[PDB]
Amino acid sequence: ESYHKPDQQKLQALKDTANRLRISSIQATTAAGSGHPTSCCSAAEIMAVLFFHTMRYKSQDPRNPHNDRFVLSKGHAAPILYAVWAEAGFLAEAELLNLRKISSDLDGHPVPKQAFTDVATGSLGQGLGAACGMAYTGKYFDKASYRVYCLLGDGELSEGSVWEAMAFASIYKLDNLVAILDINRLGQSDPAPLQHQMDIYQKRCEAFGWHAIIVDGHSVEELCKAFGQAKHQPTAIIAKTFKGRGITGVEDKESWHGKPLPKNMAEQIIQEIYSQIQSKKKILATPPQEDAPSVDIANIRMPSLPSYKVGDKIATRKAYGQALAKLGHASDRIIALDGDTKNSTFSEIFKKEHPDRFIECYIAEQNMVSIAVGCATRNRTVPFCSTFAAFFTRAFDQIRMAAISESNINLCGSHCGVSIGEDGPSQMALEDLAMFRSVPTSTVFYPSDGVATEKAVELAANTKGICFIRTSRPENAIIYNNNEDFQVGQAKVVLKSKDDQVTVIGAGVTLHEALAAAELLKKEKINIRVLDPFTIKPLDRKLILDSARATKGRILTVEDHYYEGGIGEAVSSAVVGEPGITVTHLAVNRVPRSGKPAELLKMFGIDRDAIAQAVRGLIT
Amino acid sequence: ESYHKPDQQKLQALKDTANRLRISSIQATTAAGSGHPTSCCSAAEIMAVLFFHTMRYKSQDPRNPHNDRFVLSKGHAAPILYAVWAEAGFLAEAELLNLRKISSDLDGHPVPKQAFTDVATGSLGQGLGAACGMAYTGKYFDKASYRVYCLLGDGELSEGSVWEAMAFASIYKLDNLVAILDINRLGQSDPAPLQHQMDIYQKRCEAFGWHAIIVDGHSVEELCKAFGQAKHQPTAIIAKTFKGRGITGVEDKESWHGKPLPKNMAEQIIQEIYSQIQSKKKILATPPQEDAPSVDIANIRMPSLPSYKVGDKIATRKAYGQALAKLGHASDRIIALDGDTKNSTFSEIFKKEHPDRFIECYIAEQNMVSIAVGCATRNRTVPFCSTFAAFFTRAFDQIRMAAISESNINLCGSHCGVSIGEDGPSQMALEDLAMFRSVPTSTVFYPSDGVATEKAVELAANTKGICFIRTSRPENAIIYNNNEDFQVGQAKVVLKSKDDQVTVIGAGVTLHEALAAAELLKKEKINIRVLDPFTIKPLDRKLILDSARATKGRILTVEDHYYEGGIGEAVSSAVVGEPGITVTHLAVNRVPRSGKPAELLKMFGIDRDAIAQAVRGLIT
Numbered sequence A, B: 001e002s003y004h005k006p007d008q009q010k011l012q013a014l015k016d017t018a019n020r021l022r023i024s025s026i027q028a029t030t031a032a033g034s035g036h037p038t039s040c041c042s043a044a045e046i047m048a049v050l051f052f053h054t055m056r057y058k059s060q061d062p063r064n065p066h067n068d069r070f071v072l073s074k075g076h077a078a079p080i081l082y083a084v085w086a087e088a089g090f091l092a093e094a095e096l097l098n099l100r101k102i103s104s105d106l107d108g109h110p111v112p113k114q115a116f117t118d119v120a121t122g123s124l125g126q127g128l129g130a131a132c133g134m135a136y137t138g139k140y141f142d143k144a145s146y147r148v149y150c151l152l153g154d155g156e157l158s159e160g161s162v163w164e165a166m167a168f169a170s171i172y173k174l175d176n177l178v179a180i181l182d183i184n185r186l187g188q189s190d191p192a193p194l195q196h197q198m199d200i201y202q203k204r205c206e207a208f209g210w211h212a213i214i215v216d217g218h219s220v221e222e223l224c225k226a227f228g229q230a231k232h233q234p235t236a237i238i239a240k241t242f243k244g245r246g247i248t249g250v251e252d253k254e255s256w257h258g259k260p261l262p263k264n265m266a267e268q269i270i271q272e273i274y275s276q277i278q279s280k281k282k283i284l285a286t287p288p289q290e291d292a293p294s295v296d297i298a299n300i301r302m303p304s305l306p307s308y309k310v311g312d313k314i315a316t317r318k319a320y321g322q323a324l325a326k327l328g329h330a331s332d333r334i335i336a337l338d339g340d341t342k343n344s345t346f347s348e349i350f351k352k353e354h355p356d357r358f359i360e361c362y363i364a365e366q367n368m369v370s371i372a373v374g375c376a377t378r379n380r381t382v383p384f385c386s387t388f389a390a391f392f393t394r395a396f397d398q399i400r401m402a403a404i405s406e407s408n409i410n411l412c413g414s415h416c417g418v419s420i421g422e423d424g425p426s427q428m429a430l431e432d433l434a435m436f437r438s439v440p441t442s443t444v445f446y447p448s449d450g451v452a453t454e455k456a457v458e459l460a461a462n463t464k465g466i467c468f469i470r471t472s473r474p475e476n477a478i479i480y481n482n483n484e485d486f487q488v489g490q491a492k493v494v495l496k497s498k499d500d501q502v503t504v505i506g507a508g509v510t511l512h513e514a515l516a517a518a519e520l521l522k523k524e525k526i527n528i529r530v531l532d533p534f535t536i537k538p539l540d541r542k543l544i545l546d547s548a549r550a551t552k553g554r555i556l557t558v559e560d561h562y563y564e565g566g567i568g569e570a571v572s573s574a575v576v577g578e579p580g581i582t583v584t585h586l587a588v589n590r591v592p593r594s595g596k597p598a599e600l601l602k603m604f605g606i607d608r609d610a611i612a613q614a615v616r617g618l619i620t
C-alpha cells in the first residue's frame, strides 16, 4: 500500500507514545527494583514508530500468522516491549507494574509464554538469525506479505552470530527484513567499540550486502520516512541514539546499564517526561493483509515401512538422508538445513528430491540453528538441521535458547565418536550426548541401524521439543526387521538367553561391537544380554532394570563418547540405589587421535575385545 | 630489517618449493587414502613464500619463543603444513607418507603433540582468534619483534567467530598480525557464497578496520611483495586462488573436497608437476631476532591467606574478583579477560589494580576464549576469562578445541543457577557443569564461600588443563576458617554428628540451603551430614563413600543445575554398584522463570524446605 505521510498531529502522537513508553519502562523497573530503563529509553521512538505507524498486526491476536513479526534482539529492553503491547490494548496497563514478579508472566527477558513473543531473547546476538528464519519463511514458504523487524543493540553487534545473519539475509535477498540498530554509544561496562562512528556501522552493513540508512533515532519523522521506503535488499536502519534518552542527568552516562531509578528519582523524572506529552489519546494499530496460507497440523507418517534387508550394510548417516528425503514426500512441512556438509551428512538426498525446501546455511552453525528456530515459529515448518555432531557445540547457546523459546526443531549430527577414523578429534563428537541431554526439552535418539534411523526421523518429526539424532560414519549391518515397532523411551533387547550373565548396553557402533563380543564369548560358553537403548533421553529404565535383574544385576555400558554426561552416566543415575544392581562403564577417556576406525575403537577401549574382557571381569 | 627483493632465481626456487609441497600433499593423502589435497594445492605458493621468504623462525626449534607464529586456520590442509616442516628440515621426508596412521603423529588435522603446532585446528573459524591472542601477547606483553600469520579458507569466513577476531585485531591495533585468505572459490559441497568477488572480500575486511590487499595467490612475486610491506593495521592478504591448483582436470572443479587422488591418477599428476620443477636445491629458513623476554615458570602463590571473617556475607562472584586481583599482585603472568561483564563478574577489580593486564573482549565470548588460548601458547601468560557461566555455552566449540589443543586456560562463570532471581532463564547457567565436565582436561571448581573461592583461584592458576570456577550472585556467609586447606579432588564435611541419617551434598547456594535445612531438622531431632564437594571434577569419591557409610548408606544431592550432567549424575556414576549405597537427587527439572532468588529456589525444589522434606522421606 501507499506510504501514509504522517501529519504533524500524528507525529506528535508518536512522540507522546514514545514518552509514555519511557514512563512505563521506568515505572515498571523501579517497582521491580531491577531491570534496564536506560536501554528501553534509547529505543522509545523506534518502538513507537514501529508499533503505531510502520507495522501491520492484529493487536488482539499477536500470534496471528498474517502479522508482521517483531524480534527484540536486545531482550533486556523487555519492559518497553511489554509497554507497547499495553499501549496497543493487548496487555492490561496495571500488569506492567508486576514486571519480574513470580506472580506475573512479564519476566525479565521476553519468553514465549507471552503471546506477543515468538523467540526468547536475552542471550545477545541471536534475534537477527531467528528473524532471518521468519523472513525466509515469509518470502519463500508462506509467500505472504508480512515483514520482519528486528531491534538490536550496538554492544550486541560484537557477536559473530549477528554477522552470520547479515550475510545470510543478503545471500537470500530478504527484502522483507529490517534490522534496526540502536546505536546508543554504550554497552554494559564501557562504551561500545565504535561509539557514535555511524559511518563505520554503515560501511560494515553495506559490505555485508544490506541497504544501510543512518537516522536520528530520536526523530519520529526520520524514522517514519526510513521505515516507509521498501527496498530490494535487507535494510539496516542505523539509529543514532542516547542511552537513557529523556532521563535528565542519566542520558549518555556510564554506570547506568541495568540500574533502575530509585523511587524518589523516578517520581521526579516521570513528572518531567509527563510534562512533554501533549495529549493522552492513543494511536490504534493497523491490521495486516491476510494472505498467509493455511498449514496442516496433522501427524506426519512415512509413506511406507523402511525397505532395508536384515544383513545389508548401511551407515546411519546415509539412512538419515534417505529417511529425510522419504519423509519429505509425505509432508510439505518438512524443511532441511545444512552447513556446507550435505555430501557428508547425506542431507544432499533431500536437496536433490525437494530442492525448494532445502536451505544451504554455509559454514555458520550458530545461524543455522537460529534460522531453524525462526522457521518453526508459529508452526509454519518442521525443520531438520544437519552437520557433524561435533559442530553443534558451536551452536550450544542457540540450542539452549531454543529450549527457553519452547522451539520444536530437529537436529541430526553425523560423524559421532572415534569411529570416524582418520580425521581425528576435531571432527569427533564425544560430548554431544552430554550437551543435548542437558537441554531441558530434548529427546535424544541414537539409532543403531538403518531401520532405527528411519523410525527415529519419523518419531522426531512428530515429537515436540529439541530432538537430536546421533548418526554414525561406518557402515553397520541392518539388525532389525523393517516392521519392528519403535517408540520414544522404548529400548530393544537384541540378544538374550536364559543363562545371560551381564546386560551389555551399547548404541551405534558399540552396539555392533557388543554383538561381536557376544560371539567371541559364545566360544567360551558365556552368554550376554545385549540392549539397544534407541533413545538415550528418555531412557527405558524399566527394560534396563528387568534386563539387569535377569543377568545377576550386572549392567555394562559401552559408548563412543566421553565418560561424563553420556549413556553410562544416564544409566547410572537411573538405577543407582536399586538393590543388587551394579553398573560398569566403558567409554573414551581422553582426547583421541587419528587412525583407522577399528584401531581407534581398540585404542580407546570400546571395541568387541574390550567388551569381552569387561564381561569376563564382571563374572569373576 | 630491509625487505630483500628476491631475484628471479629466488622466485623460481619459491615456485619449485610450492610444487614440491603440492607433490607431498598428493603423495601423503593418496598413501593415507583420505585427506584434502585440493585444499593444500590452492595454498602452495602462500605456504612457500611464508616459510621460505617472509617468516623468521628456528627451523630446528619450532616452539622457540622468538619465532614468528603461523596458525593454519584451515586445518584440513595439514598435509601441506607437514610438508613445509619437512622442507625446512625439521621433519623427516619419509614420515610424510605416514599421514593419518595410528603409528604416526602426522594426524588428520594439526595438534600440539607436533612441535610446530601451537593450537589444534579442524573446527573452522577459530584460528584467527588464537592468532589475535598470540599477536596481542607479542605486541603488549612480550613486547617482541615476532609476527603472527594466519591462513584461512573462504568457506571458513562464513563463521561469525572470524569477524569477532577481525574486529578485535583492529580495536587493539595488531599491526604484527597478517591474515591470508585462500579465496579458492569453493567450499566443501558448493561454491563459497562470494566465489571470486574479490572486491566484496576487500570491502568487508576494510569495513572491519584491516588493510586489505588483493593478490594473485599463485604468484610468488605478488605474495613476496604483499607480505614484504608492514603496515600500521592488521593486514589481510586476499589471495585469489584455484582449488586443486596444478592438478590437471581437477583445478577449479567441484566434487573434489576431501577426496584423495587414486594411485594411478596421483602418479600421472605428480609426473606433470615434477616436470615443472627447475631445481632440487631447497631454500633455508631465516632465524628470528631473539628479543622475547624470559618468563618464570614457578608456582604462583597468594601473597597472604584469605582475609574473610567467618560469618561475614559475600557473594562468590565478588570474592572471585577480589581473589584474582590479589593473585595479580603475586605474579605478572596473570592476565584477565572479560566480555563486557566486568562490573557483574567483578573482574573490574583486577582491571582497576592491573589495567595493563586486563583485556576487554566485548560481547564476543567465542573470540574471548580463543584469545585466551592464544595468550597461553608457549606458556607466555596465565589467563583467566570471565563472563556469566550461561554465556560460556556460546564458546563450547572453542573450549572443546582448547582441550584438543592441550591449552591451560582458566574460566570463571558467574550468575549460575536460578539463584540469580529476576533476570530469568536466559541469564541462568543450568548446564555449565554438564558442559565443563564433558571437556576431557577439565577441573571444575564450585566454591561455596569467599574462602573457598580464593583458594580455587589459587589452585586453578597452578593446575594444567581447562579450569572452570562456578561463581554465584547471592551473598552467602563465610563458613570456612581462612587457614582451611583446600585441594583439587578433596571435599569438606561442614556438618556431622554421630547420629547422622543422610549425607547431603550441596554446593554454592544449595550448600547454604542444606545447612539451613539441617537447622530445621534439628528441631525434629534429625541430624544430617553436610558435604561440600569443592571440586565437582574430580570428585572426592573416598570422602563421599565414607560419609555415606556413616549415614546408613544414604546420599542426597542438591544442586542449582539441571538434572543431566551435574553434581547428582557425577555422584551417582561414582558410587553406583557400591553395596548399601543409595543416591537421591534434587535439581532443576525444567526451564525456569523470573522471581526472587528464594522464591525460585523454592519453586524448583532445591531450597532448605525441599531438602528437609527429602531427608524425612529417606528415613521413612
Ligand SMILES: Cc1ncc(C[n+]2csc(CCOP(=O)(O)OP(=O)(O)O)c2C)c(N)n1
Residues within 6 Å of the ligand: A036, A038, A039, A042, A074, A076, A122, A123, A124, A125, A152, A153, A154, A155, A156, A157, A182, A184, A186, A187, A188, A192, A243, B339, B340, B341, B363, B391, B394
Ligand atoms: C551473549 C551475551 N553475552 C553477554 C550478555 C550480558 N549483557 C546483557 S546486556 C549487555 C550489554 C548490552 O549492550 P547493548 O547491546 O549495547 O545494548 P543497550 O542496553 O545499550 O541497548 C550485556 C553485556 C548477554 N546478555 N548475552
Ligand SMILES: Cc1ncc(C[n+]2csc(CCOP(=O)(O)OP(=O)(O)O)c2C)c(N)n1
Residues within 6 Å of the ligand: A339, A340, A341, A363, A391, A394, B036, B038, B039, B042, B074, B076, B122, B123, B124, B125, B152, B153, B154, B155, B156, B157, B182, B184, B186, B187, B188, B192, B243
Ligand atoms: C566449524 C566447522 N563446520 C564445518 C566443518 C566441515 N568442513 C571441513 S572443511 C569444510 C570446507 C572448508 O572450506 P574452505 O574454508 O573454503 O576451505 P578450502 O578447503 O576450500 O581451502 C567444511 C565445511 C568444519 N571443519 N568446521
Ligand SMILES: O=[P-]([O-])[O-]
Residues within 6 Å of the ligand: A343, A344, A473
Ligand atoms: O564424508 P567424509 O567423512 O568421508
Ligand SMILES: O=[P-]([O-])[O-]
Residues within 6 Å of the ligand: B343, B344, B473
Ligand atoms: O550484576 P547484576 O546481576 O546485578
Ligand SMILES: [Ca+2]
Residues within 6 Å of the ligand: A153, A154, A155, A182, A183, A184, A185, A186, A187, A192, A243
Ligand atoms: Ca548500547
Ligand SMILES: [Ca+2]
Residues within 6 Å of the ligand: B153, B154, B155, B182, B183, B184, B185, B186, B187, B192, B243
Ligand atoms: Ca575454499
